[PDB]
Amino acid sequence: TGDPANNPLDRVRILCTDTDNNEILIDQSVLEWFYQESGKDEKKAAIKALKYLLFQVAKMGDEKVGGVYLRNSSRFKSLKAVYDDLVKSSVSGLPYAGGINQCDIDMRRQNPCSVKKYTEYGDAVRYYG
């Protein structure tokens, strides 16, 4: 709508990169719903909107009414490449290796519904097994 400083909804547009006002693909009513369900949090609202944008772009087809032409075919191919690169191919947490943390080790030993191994690391220099 032009103002990103004092409009939460338009901030969603910036993150969802629909700041065109000439080829609008995500209607404000749809955008308002995404904002409402996403606890009025813009960041987790864009992700929902961005996925919705991908669906709309894919369904669109090549149109030619006399005088005006519009090739929508080569948009998803371009859009997907950005989406995977900048959104999907971006980890949101920490990985997990095996026995690299004793505190983790003890915490996992408290679980009763777990198999009991015969020999474990460390059971060669422990007085009380």
Partner: protein
Amino acid sequence: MRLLNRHSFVVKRKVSEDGHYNEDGDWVASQDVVSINCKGNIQPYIKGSVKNGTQIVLPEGIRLTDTRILFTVAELRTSDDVDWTEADIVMIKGHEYEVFMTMDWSEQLAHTSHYEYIIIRRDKMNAVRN
């Protein structure tokens, strides 16, 4: 970035569609004319007889006329004798234009429906009221 909304002009529509003939017999146009900005694409109309930006050397002077095509999504009207409509005036560089002839692709497609208009520059004439 739709090309359909590149240019931006101001249209004067005779909103108060009255257009009555006074008791004397002359024509009294609509007294209320509003000017609201629209958006569209204005291109020269290249088709045979139609002359664009052509000076006509009359034995009285040199008159200039032109004819542009207008692609837009707005429903600009034209002078109609059944609904008592009175056309629309487009403006480019100050000079008034008139919307003669219309093509109506309003419902056909989904994201490409548009109107095509043929706008003609209005000739210079002394103005008298009635």
